[PDB]
Paper text:
These successes are driving new areas of IO development, including exploiting T cell receptor ([name]) recognition of short antigenic peptide fragments presented at the cell surface by peptide-human leukocyte antigens (pHLAs). However, naturally occurring TCRs are selected in the thymus to bind pHLAs with relatively weak affinities (∼micromolar) and short half-lives (seconds). In this study, we explored the fundamental mechanisms that underpin the interactions between engineered affinity-enhanced human TCRs (aeTCRs) with pHLAs. These data demonstrate that aeTCRs preserve a native-like [name] binding geometry but achieve affinity enhancement via a range of different energetic mechanisms.
Overall, and in line with previously published findings, all aeTCRs bound their cognate pHLA with virtually identical crossing angles and CDR loop positions compared to their WT progenitor TCRs. For the MEL5_α24β17 aeTCR, a total of 19 mutations (with 17 of these on [name] paratope) gave rise to the approximate 30,000-fold increase in affinity, which was found to be primarily entropically driven. This is likely an entropically favorable process due to the expulsion of ordered water molecules that typically surround these hydrophobic or aromatic groups upon binding. The only mutation that showed a large negative effect on the binding energy was V93D CDR3α. This mutation, however, results in a new interloop HB with R96 (K96 in the WT MEL5 [name]).
Numbering used by the authors:
A (entry chain B): 0 to 99
B (entry chain A): 1 to 276
C (entry chain E): 1 to 244
D (entry chain C): 1 to 10
E (entry chain D): 1 to 197
Write the structure that this text describes.
């Protein structure tokens, strides 16, 4: 048995512009086993209606998934990706940075 | 360039829920074109790219039969492996299989592969001669003996070198507008200081396809000389990919650094420099 | 060693009766199991394909269903048969997965569904003795067994000599002939020959018996005719060897 | 086109 | 059946010759191919399979696959009367087999010592219809049905007496009408041997 901790990236589909429709992405990769909990948060609250890609995996057998939801960024609203996995001692929160 | 067709299969046992979760996906290069999920309502292999939709009902029915057969085979495997590793019925376990073929720029066969894993570790894999097996341990040796007696490698070779490649070529032609397209990366450099001294320059690459790219930083030139923080190439969600590479440079002397972007969609490598 | 076996082998039933066919396999585990139906002059057509854990495909037969109560037990059923359900039902197996092991059929289950049971008649059987002229032109003696007046056309003819079935020197018509070619419900006839040496036919101790297994009604089938019910039965005739 | 041969149980 | 096409036959081959059976398929994703032999009244029996281009021999049988022309064939060397049967081609179109409708093959026995004769047989007790036996003719002789509604003639049938490698063709006719005489029973046969006491 091998368990692997997920890598997490949170970003937008297109370059952010305040008040313009876009997509918020949370890409989790390199993990095992496949069971994983991912939520996108808006100002600390779970964004309902979030979709994700079909489970797939890399050369080293580790899994990857893209979770996403349409959204419209603003100057003040804070976005984040919350992830939990058996390899993590507690859920992990990654904040969305416009330029990352 | 070269191309590939790959199928990925995952089965996860679910003690106390009855049947395992099974998910299959197929790709041509970096484009997903089919999927099957045991928990979905259709119980059909489903299209995920526009060009595969033109295949007729005979094709879909056949793919659906085969993918369901893979599923049930993995389900038997989950039981056998639990026995081989002396595990209980209480734990969730995972079986994964991947196979496919690569072709070169002339679309002729380059290589084939067929690999299998249990609980996230290599179990058995076909070597590149498409005849020999690499077995991870005593359990996988038993599987190897059974598969040698049944000429599994010979069967897989006929599929990987023949069928796989013939269908990859068909798909490449039918979906030429999609699969043979090259989207050059849109690039730009970003600026972030640290109040004093050194700064960080971040070279971006967006909306590109295929996924393979090379973002390199040179100092003065010739030798790539700068420990850059580069993130994993990542999907945009629209079929294209994104990536960046950042270096820590002393305030001023920023012109000594040039970002080298290399991608199939570029006739010549690209070079960026910080401009206020 | 693997074996696949199906039962019953031949069945004659009225329209509206239930059907139950069984198939069992031995020597392999978690096999793929298949039901096929084959019409005269055509190849087997798939009805159901089951993997070890359940159905994978079916050509949604109009009036049939399948079940797999155990790993190596496969059943094909119908509550009320239609005339169109007549056919040769074949069970097959393949080894777990998608590979080359197996792909073997059982013996098959021949089903004839009938609209009117009054048409059913077993065969009358008679043995005809060798022509002395034959016995002298050659040193061989040909016995002929004739089975006539039977309907439907399902019979199995065998020869027995001194209590043991024999195969040498025998040839049986592969298909029966219609006694009235212009009638949809014509009864049938079948002939067989058993050729032996003159010496063997001339020994009075030699006993020859032509035996015809006929498949007909089951004991409980509806019947209104005066005559005894034409159930599945064996009808035979005999002759003893004879010196001039 | 998925494999239709060479897929056996372990 | 459009998915798998085979000529129906009947195809005749002389004993000793090579029989060639052909099959074409339309399902392009077919990855394995099979030949079955089916005797009258029996289920099909697997002869062989192949999953690769070229030829595959197993004793007297050779299967051939040409994927570019979607053609599968079966060659049978040293054909024997016991090879007479319907040969079914099948393709695996994903987890199952799809069949053609078959090619019926008849292998004509080589009769080396023909002495055609028509005899009358009769176990004369409780049976109003006597029987006539046409036997020992060569395989080029074909038997036709009677042109009389009261006269019954079976098709030729080939029997084998293990001793002297003796094989013989025969056909039987009978009738319960009065004027029926064996000397008249048959039609397009070969002249020799019509005895009468």
């Amino acid at each position: 048995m091998i368990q692997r901790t997920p890598k997490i990236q949170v970003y937008s589909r297109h370059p952010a512009e305040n008040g313009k429709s876009n997509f918020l992405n949370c890409y989790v990769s390199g993990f095992h086993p496949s069971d994983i909990e991912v939520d996108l948060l808006k100002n600390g609250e779970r964004i309902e209606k979030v979709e994700h890609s079909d489970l797939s995996f890399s050369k080293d057998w580790s899994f990857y998934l893209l979770y996403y939801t349409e959204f419209t960024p603003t100057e003040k609203d804070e976005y984040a990706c919350r992830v939990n996995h058996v390899t993590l001692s507690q859920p992990k929160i990654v904040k969305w940075d416009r330029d990352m | 360039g070269s191309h590939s067709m790959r199928y990925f299969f995952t089965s996860v046992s679910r003690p106390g829920r009855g049947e395992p979760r099974f998910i299959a996906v197929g790709y041509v290069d970096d484009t997903q074109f089919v999927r099957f999920d045991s928990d979905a309502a259709s119980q059909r292999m489903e299209p995920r790219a526009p060009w595969i939709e033109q295949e007729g009902p005979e094709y879909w029915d056949g793919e659906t039969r085969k993918v369901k057969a893979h599923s049930q085979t993995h389900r038997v495997d989950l039981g056998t492996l639990r026995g081989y590793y002396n595990q209980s019925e209480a734990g969730s376990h995972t079986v994964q299989r991947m196979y496919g073929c690569d072709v070169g720029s002339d679309w002729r066969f380059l290589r084939g592969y067929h690999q299998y894993a249990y609980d996230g570790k290599d179990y058995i894999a076909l070597k590149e001669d498409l005849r020999s097996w690499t077995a991870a341990d005593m359990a996988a040796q038993t599987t190897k003996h059974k598969w040698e007696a049944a000429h599994v490698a010979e069967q897989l070779r006929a599929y990987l070198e023949g069928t796989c490649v013939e269908w990859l070529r068909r798909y490449l032609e039918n979906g030429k507008e999609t699969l043979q397209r090259t989207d050059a990366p849109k690039t730009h450099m970003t600026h972030h200081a640290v109040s004093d001294h050194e700064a960080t320059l971040r070279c971006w690459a967006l909306s590109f396809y295929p996924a393979e790219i090379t973002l390199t930083w040179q100092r003065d030139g010739e030798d790539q000389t700068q420990d850059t923080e580069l993130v994993e190439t990542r999907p945009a969600g629209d079929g294209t990919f994104q990536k960046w590479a950042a270096v820590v440079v002393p305030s001023g002397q920023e012109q000594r650094y040039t970002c080298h972007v290399q991608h199939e969609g570029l006739p010549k490598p690209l070079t960026l420099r910080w401009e206020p | 060693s693997q074996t696949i076996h199906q039962w019953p082998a031949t069945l004659v039933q009225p329209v509206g009766s239930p059907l139950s066919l069984e198939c069992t396999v031995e020597g392999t585990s978690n096999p793929n199991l298949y039901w096929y139906r084959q019409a005269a002059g055509r190849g087997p057509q798939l009805l159901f394909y089951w993997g070890p854990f359940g159905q994978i495909s079916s050509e949604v037969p109009q009036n049939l269903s399948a079940s797999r109560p155990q790993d190596r037990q496969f059943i094909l059923s119908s509550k009320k048969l239609l005339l169109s359900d007549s056919g040769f039902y074949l069970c097959a197996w393949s080894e777990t997965g998608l590979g080359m092991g197996g792909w073997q059929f059982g013996e098959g289950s021949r089903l004839t569904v009938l609209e009117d049971l009054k048409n059913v008649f077993p065969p009358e059987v008679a043995v005809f003795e060798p022509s002395e002229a034959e016995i002298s032109h050659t040193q061989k003696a040909t016995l002929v067994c004739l089975a006539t007046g039977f309907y439907p056309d399902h019979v199995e003819l065998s020869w027995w000599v001194n209590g043991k079935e024999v195969h040498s020197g025998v040839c049986t018509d592969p298909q029966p002939l219609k006694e009235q070619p212009a009638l949809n419900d014509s009864r049938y006839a079948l002939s067989s020959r058993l050729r032996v040496s003159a010496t063997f036919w001339q020994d009075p101790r030699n006993h020859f018996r032509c035996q015809v297994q006929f498949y007909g009604l089951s004991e409980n089938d509806e019947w209104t005719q005066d005559r005894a019910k034409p159930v599945t039965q064996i009808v035979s005739a005999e002759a003893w060897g004879r010196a001039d | 086109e998925a494999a239709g041969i060479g897929i056996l149980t372990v | 059946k459009q998915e798998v096409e085979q000529n129906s036959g009947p195809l005749s081959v002389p004993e000793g010759a090579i029989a060639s059976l052909n099959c074409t398929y339309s399902f392009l994703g077919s990855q394995s191919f099979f030949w079955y032999r089916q005797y009258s009244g029996k289920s099909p029996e697997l002869i062989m399979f192949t999953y690769r281009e070229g030829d595959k021999e197993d004793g007297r049988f050779t299967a051939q696959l040409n994927k570019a022309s979607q053609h599968v064939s079966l060659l049978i060397r040293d054909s024997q009367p016991s090879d007479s049967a319907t040969y079914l081609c099948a393709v695996n179109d994903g987890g199952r087999l799809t069949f053609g409708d078959g090619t019926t093959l008849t292998v004509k026995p080589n009769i080396q010592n023909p002495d055609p004769a028509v005899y009358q047989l009769r176990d004369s007790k409780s049976s109003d219809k006597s029987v006539c036996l046409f036997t020992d003719f060569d395989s080029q002789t074909n038997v036709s049905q009677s042109k009389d509604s009261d006269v019954y003639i079976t098709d030729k049938c080939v029997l084998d007496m293990r001793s002297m490698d003796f094989k013989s063709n025969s056909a039987v006719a009978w009738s319960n009408k009065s004027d029926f005489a064996c000397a008249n029973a048959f039609n397009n046969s070969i002249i020799p041997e019509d005895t009468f006491f």
